[PDB]
Amino acid sequence: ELWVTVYYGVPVWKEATTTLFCASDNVWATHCCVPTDPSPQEVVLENVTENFNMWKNNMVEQMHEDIISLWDQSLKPCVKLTPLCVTLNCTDLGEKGEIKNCSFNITTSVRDKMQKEYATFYKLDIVPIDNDNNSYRLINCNTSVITQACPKVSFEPIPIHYCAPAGFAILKCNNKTFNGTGPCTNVSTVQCTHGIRPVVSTQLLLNGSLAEEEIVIRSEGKTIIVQLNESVEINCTRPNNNTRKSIHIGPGRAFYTTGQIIGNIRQAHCNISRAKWNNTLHKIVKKLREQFPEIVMHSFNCGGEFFYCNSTQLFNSTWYNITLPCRIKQIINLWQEVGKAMYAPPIGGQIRCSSNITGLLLTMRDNWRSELYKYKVVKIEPLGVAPTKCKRR
Amino acid sequence: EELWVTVYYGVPVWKEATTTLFCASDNVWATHCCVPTDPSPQEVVLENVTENFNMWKNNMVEQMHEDIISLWDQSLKPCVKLTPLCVTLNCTDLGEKGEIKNCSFNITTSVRDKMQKEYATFYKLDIVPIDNDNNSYRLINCNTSVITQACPKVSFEPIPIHYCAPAGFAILKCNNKTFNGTGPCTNVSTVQCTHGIRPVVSTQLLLNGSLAEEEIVIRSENFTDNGKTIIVQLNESVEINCTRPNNNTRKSIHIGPGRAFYTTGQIIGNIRQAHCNISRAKWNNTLHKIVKKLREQFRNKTIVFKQSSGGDPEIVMHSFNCGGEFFYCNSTQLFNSTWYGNESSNITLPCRIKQIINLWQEVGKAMYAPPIGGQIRCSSNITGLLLTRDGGNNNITTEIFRPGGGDMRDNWRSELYKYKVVKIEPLGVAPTKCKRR
Amino acid sequence: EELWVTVYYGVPVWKEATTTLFCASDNVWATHCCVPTDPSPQEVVLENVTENFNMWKNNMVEQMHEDIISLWDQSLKPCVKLTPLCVTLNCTDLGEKGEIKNCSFNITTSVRDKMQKEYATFYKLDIVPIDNDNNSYRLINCNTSVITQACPKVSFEPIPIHYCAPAGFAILKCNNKTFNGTGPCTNVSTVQCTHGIRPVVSTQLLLNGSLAEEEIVIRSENFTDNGKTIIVQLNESVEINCTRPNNNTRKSIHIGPGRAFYTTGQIIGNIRQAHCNISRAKWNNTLHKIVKKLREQFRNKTIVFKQSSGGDPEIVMHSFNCGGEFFYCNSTQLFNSTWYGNESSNITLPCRIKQIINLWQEVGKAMYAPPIGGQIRCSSNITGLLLTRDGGNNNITTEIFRPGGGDMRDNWRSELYKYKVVKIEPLGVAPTKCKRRV
Amino acid sequence: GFLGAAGSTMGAASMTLTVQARQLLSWGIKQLQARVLAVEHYLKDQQLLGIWGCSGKLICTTAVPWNATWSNKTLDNIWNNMTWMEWEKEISNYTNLIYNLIEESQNQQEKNETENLTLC
Amino acid sequence: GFLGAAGSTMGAASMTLTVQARQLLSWGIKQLQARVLAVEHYLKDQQLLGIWGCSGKLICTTAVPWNATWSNKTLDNIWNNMTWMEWEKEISNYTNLIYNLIEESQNQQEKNETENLTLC
Amino acid sequence: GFLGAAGSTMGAASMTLTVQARQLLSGGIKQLQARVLAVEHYLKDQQLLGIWGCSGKLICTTAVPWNATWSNKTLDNIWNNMTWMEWEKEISNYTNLIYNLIEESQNQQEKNETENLTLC
Amino acid sequence: XXXXXXXXXXXXXXXXXXXXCXXXXXXXXXXXXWXXXXXXXXXXXXXXXXXXXXXXXXXXXXXXXXXXXXXXXXXXXXXXXXXXXXXXXXXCXXXXXXXXXXXXXXXXXXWXXXXXXXX
Amino acid sequence: XXXXXXXXXXXXXXXXXXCXXXXXXXXXXXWXXXXXXXXXXXXXXXXXXXXXXXXXXXXXXXXXXXXXXXXXXXXXXXXXXXXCXXXXXXXXFXXXX
Ligand SMILES: *[C@@H]1O[C@H](CO)[C@@H](O[C@@H]2O[C@H](CO)[C@@H](O)[C@H](O)[C@H]2NC(C)=O)[C@H](O)[C@H]1NC(C)=O
Ligand SMILES: *[C@@H]1O[C@H](CO)[C@@H](O[C@@H]2O[C@H](CO)[C@@H](O)[C@H](O)[C@H]2NC(C)=O)[C@H](O)[C@H]1NC(C)=O
Ligand SMILES: *[C@@H]1O[C@H](CO)[C@@H](O[C@@H]2O[C@H](CO)[C@@H](O)[C@H](O)[C@H]2NC(C)=O)[C@H](O)[C@H]1NC(C)=O
Ligand SMILES: *[C@@H]1O[C@H](CO)[C@@H](O[C@@H]2O[C@H](CO)[C@@H](O)[C@H](O)[C@H]2NC(C)=O)[C@H](O)[C@H]1NC(C)=O
Ligand SMILES: *[C@@H]1O[C@H](CO)[C@@H](O)[C@H](O)[C@H]1NC(C)=O
Ligand SMILES: *[C@@H]1O[C@H](CO)[C@@H](O)[C@H](O)[C@H]1NC(C)=O
Ligand SMILES: *[C@@H]1O[C@H](CO)[C@@H](O)[C@H](O)[C@H]1NC(C)=O
Ligand SMILES: *[C@@H]1O[C@H](CO)[C@@H](O)[C@H](O)[C@H]1NC(C)=O
Ligand SMILES: *[C@@H]1O[C@H](CO)[C@@H](O)[C@H](O)[C@H]1NC(C)=O
């Protein structure tokens, strides 16, 4: 004779998707205003096997949506460059022809007066028209609205910790060689993820986490995470020492450009150590053999400028100092949106960055799966029912 | 004998209340009503329960009206505002004989310093003369209102939606098949969500609605008040097949940085009149049954279904959205009949197309419906009518009824006439023989 | 010994706290402050309670400031932006004799291919010369800012505003009639809502405010710091009767598809100067009593009142919203005196009317106040006064005071100075002789 | 089913108190207001039950005597020949009086139970 | 730690940490939704414990007999050699039926207490 | 009146706890935040009294001994001289410590109750 | 705590008489009180003294003013110009008036012994 | 304020000695008893409530304003005779037995 007994506090959970909030120790500091745990706790769950799937992880989709929303809200209250889209009279500034000095007739704050203004554009920002070869328009002029980023709003990525709402928990896979799918036999429970840097790139993954033991290749040879021996530190620079200029295109709407360049014009570039890259490629091939314009270049945000580097000296080898030229682009469609673009105004002085290569994409959300692959969100269900011999009075 | 007050929590009682309802579907309606519906929704029949309903005091209709207007207003914000087109148009007749014109104008295009002469096709109802030269036209009310182009990828297609009460509230449904929309109902059930209702917009005939289970039911707040709308709910639908036979080829002209105006570049084949085909036998039988019920309501009276009173096409004609095109059909071959009660037992309606419309009668606002390429065909079910009775007939033996009702609420009361929202009051007290301790 | 912890819930204690207060009332303000106040609201006097107050660090002023700015910004969004009018104006003099100009301009109207020549009436303060040609003006600031029309159906008339604490919080009030704004208060009461406060905007004189219960009270954060505002709360008001005598006929100029610009089409009769009348005897007695109180903080000094040191009308003139139009009155006849303390017992101030107003010292934005037809009259009560003391004026047995304070918080700080928001903490513990029964 | 006993007698409907209880707790601004309001109504009832000595109960007896002026019907006519809707319609102007009497009784009970613990 | 005994047998858990972790309370739409949902989950669990007569307890014994249809295993192989995850996730899909039976039993018990004057 | 006893001694003030308990219990984006926060504060107090063995009572005697470190004053020199505003300052730095001890005591009590289950 | 017996100090007729409890418990922890333990009579409490003097003297013995220093841990009382009425023994008791737990001013929790300080 | 009352010495019997009062001291009352040549000890407090460290069977009937003694614990050893006290006012006590 068994009776129903209700137990509250049962250590069980089920898969669930909920809204996660972010915390951090600038758009990211403003958005992720919740402070982090100064000494985060983690509980190892012994004798627990949990199935993970990094390609069905809704934390990646939420991270993506939060990034798109934050970029849209950050650029929304900023100057829209619609007074432009006029024929430009461009003369070469110089490698020669990469930067042009373009003049144009723009209506200023007063609607009765036209002014002849000058601005500096990169070859990638303008499209030639007519047969004069000095008549140009902005590359995205007739298809999109180009919004100038506010000069006081920084998009520099900082570590972001994703935290579950109370009542939910994040399970972490502690198998250092886990391939991103299937059962994990060393599972721990955390409230917040590690610090994830929302870095945006197209080929090489810069900054972020590193594999604890060896290079791990995850697919289904697609996403490669570099072992404890960090891959090449990549030193990228824009040597052209610029002086920022500002003109007005309407009441309260200032357009920023480059007024002059001090010294000689030089090409932007990135320096990758040759021996370390050769060792990285060798180790990647060893692991691969166990199983057997904007989309052909390495894009990244360096100092606030958008670099497009020619990654052809890195992936031109056959198996069993490397200076990559880079172009700088100002008018971009960062998220491939229809009808929208950002102008990303130029920064004066010179720019130098030093980034850590942590992984590779061979053959977007894939830039972040490489960080969130070890986490899943579950819902806690503390109410359980089981038979006992005890009966209520 | 001594009794004590005992508190009961979970008492099955309620009171009339107005709250905010949410929506569940199953483009604009699927996006707005972003709540999956329950498979096999539950309904609880309340036995031995009588509840008073009043379809003309139902705040669910007021909420549906506000939600529809809000959804239309929000849906048109992120898309083209047609202000560069409020210019003199040089229009020439195509091919009828002036219904559709080929209008040319000087407009600044996607490049700020470039002006071009461009052509667009407009319907007669969308333009007005500027001067006495037979060539200069202007867009209708473009100088007093902002004309917003319907968002090209946003489909304002009516789909079934369900209105759902929040927790703590319930929707009571009247299950009397011949309920006249007011007074007590003795076949009452409790639901969480309403049945599927299609937000169809029309001015005279109710399309794609619910049919009566057993008979045509005619409802009016006050039948002897000639100022009230009479809602006729049919028990058998009438098929109406509406066609726009012109094989329009869509053209897209750019007027700014990704700001494009959509028009018709050419028509392939000849130009023909849009029309709707209503079966004559079905309509005649429908009018026979409607007049029979009206005679029951209006004893020993001759009933004459005269056409509408005249004036602006928005009220005079039967309008509807057919595949994104807005049709205005004369609807004069329907009605225009005299019945005496001693009777026993296709119709092709011409239609006009209007691209610039103001569905919600807003001041300073209008919408431009871009043309749809190809031929347009719709087949709708007429499930009811809105009739208005003429006054001044109190001393005669004949009553005059015309198509047309009141505002848009009349098109939603025809579905939300058996539902009311109530608040659950789980607490109550009662005497008992048991004292605390 | 033999004592145990006992938990008490409902303990009458509180701690200093900040939160968001809701607005109650009994038009922008009627629309926003939609919550009705309680009839016959209660106040509980707390006997034997001493509470420290500090009117200069009171977060209620910061909230009122943010709420006022937010409403003034939000109510002008769905309204006409006057950007087509940043054009060259001809501005032939209308007059006096130059205060009001009749400005003609070429403006594209609601039809995009039709340009019209329109006429509008502007005040001298609303326009700036463009070139050496005298007949060439543009709006006072359409270079860097967007001018938004006041939106004639939106009324900004101040009404009593009651700030009310949310549940879990309470507002403590100081009932000491001569409280100096800082330090301990020994007559403290608890309320849920503040008294009605009118959000009147002014730069020098506080209008339609509260009066002191018994005596004029002069408050300052630090009376020896020449950088702080001195707020004078009067115990008797002085009426100020303001008139704009011109009989205006309003005209509407259509600048776009449903966007109309409102101006004055014609003025009927003669052009007259706007002005405000302050009774001379009442002002002289009020100022005398102010000096009597100032002499308590600045002992045996001569008290000298002068006009402000100089600057734009928004800084040196007394500005206010009268009848819906913004007046800038030359308050030089009120603060031009020398007092020694032994002086035992109609002033007409000329005023200008301005239409392009940069409120809240915003950057890149301004409001255009359209004219109101007919004549404007109002009558306000002067209930307080903002003074600034000249720095670097010591060692001469003389003090010089000038009208004008700091930013708008000083007006709102003239009210809300007797109130503070506290959070209620009903839970606490204490020892006793009982132990839990188990 | 939910409210299935609505047309049943007061006695029979007392067997369904949990059925309704489970249904009391279950753009953008509108949905947040609907959920917050549902929570506030739930808590309002739970607080009222907590003022009274009725927390955690479906049926809660009190020490307040029944006043014949409110209703002079027999217990069988109330529990076996009347529905809860009819009862609420009859006791429509005594709800606040009864609630205040219950609160006063609970306050007196708590005052008497706070003391005389024998502990100290 | 929290869920530390998740891999232990059912009778070995003996945990209070997982309810301490459930004392949830110790642009702006997402945070309001997260806070409202946290409140709703807290209140729903408290409501279920209340209507079952289990408020304030972690182990609540009821008067509903166990039906071998739901599970025909003996206690020797339920509280040992099995975890709470396996029990609740793989061999228990009768949760709503059992909860309804618990609620019916609690309501019957409270009505029985009101009807029987030997307890009054 | 509300907080009327704030200036009264702790003893006299403890006899009017219902004034504050009743005032506090019976409680676009900014308005929703205010409503959610008020709910969260109410529930926070209920959760704290819940984890303590104090729910449902205004005065809850615990099993935690008083430590002379927190205050070495006699009861007469606490209850008949100081007000609650002063008392909550004198031991402010020990509030969290005392609260933790109360929770720990309840946990031990729960274990002692768990050891003796009904009919087991 | 220890229910210490009252001390006796007998006196001549029309001379002051006194007693003290010498309580083991801290005097300031409880509302210790004195009563007149007359033979064949009611307790006839003299004053429900508080833990820190301020005694609420009984109307029947309104002139009583029992008080003692807390430092001595010895509640005390005296009768001025004691006479035959002093034969009633001076009884020590602790009132059941636990701080912020009870508001009784009688219902003595414990009695020790009374001092028959007759005069 | 008054607390006159009927009484008899304890003699292993179920006492029913009613007390008088000047007020309806339904709860503001107490009972205590003393053996010959001994100090008193509380038998009951707050009328019906039993005294601490005493048999519940020895508590008074305490029928509110008509409170009276009781002794279910009618032991041969019940040497202590009961008396009531009125806590409501002026420290009124009964002489009783
Ligand atoms: C490879 O490139 C790095 C820079 O990326 C060179 O390092 C710099 O060398 C110069 C001397 O030529 C130093 O002044 C700089 O300070 C060095 N930079 C850093 C960041 O350390 C390096 O010398 C190059 N290697 C070779 C072989 O030329
Ligand atoms: C990129 O620059 C970094 C420094 O910014 C170089 O790394 C440093 O190299 C020097 C060589 O003497 C070492 O002493 C430093 O300790 C290194 N720094 C760190 C942080 O490790 C790096 O080698 C450069 N990369 C290339 C490709 O030239
Ligand atoms: C009117 O009440 C009757 C009961 O007296 C309802 O009868 C059944 O209700 C269920 C509800 O789910 C339906 O599925 C059945 O089809 C109904 N039975 C029949 C024979 O029709 C009835 O539904 C109620 N409604 C109507 C419109 O009559
Ligand atoms: C001071 O000014 C006030 C108005 O500001 C004058 O009051 C007006 O006086 C005339 C007669 O002189 C009356 O007809 C008006 O009705 C009064 N106005 C008001 C508002 O009451 C006042 O007379 C002036 N004083 C002096 C001495 O000239
Ligand atoms: C499992 O994870 C924990 C995390 O602390 C780690 O210490 C342990 O070594 C891991 N075990 C294995 C087998 O990887
Ligand atoms: C309308 O079309 C439907 C098929 O779509 C057909 O059944 C019906 O008879 C047609 N009726 C008329 C009047 O054209
Ligand atoms: C306060 O007002 C009265 C008139 O009500 C006036 O006589 C008195 O002087 C004023 N006090 C001061 C200090 O000015
Ligand atoms: C202002 O007008 C009021 C109207 O009542 C009048 O009493 C007052 O004396 C006037 N004051 C001045 C200074 O004109
Ligand atoms: C996990 O299993 C091992 C088997 O030896 C056991 O010792 C250990 O206690 C188990 N862990 C838990 C948390 O139950």
Ligand SMILES: *[C@@H]1O[C@H](CO)[C@@H](O)[C@H](O)[C@H]1NC(C)=O
């Ligand atoms: C305030 O203190 C006085 C003695 O100074 C006292 O009589 C009065 O009762 C106290 N007030 C309160 C509310 O305790």
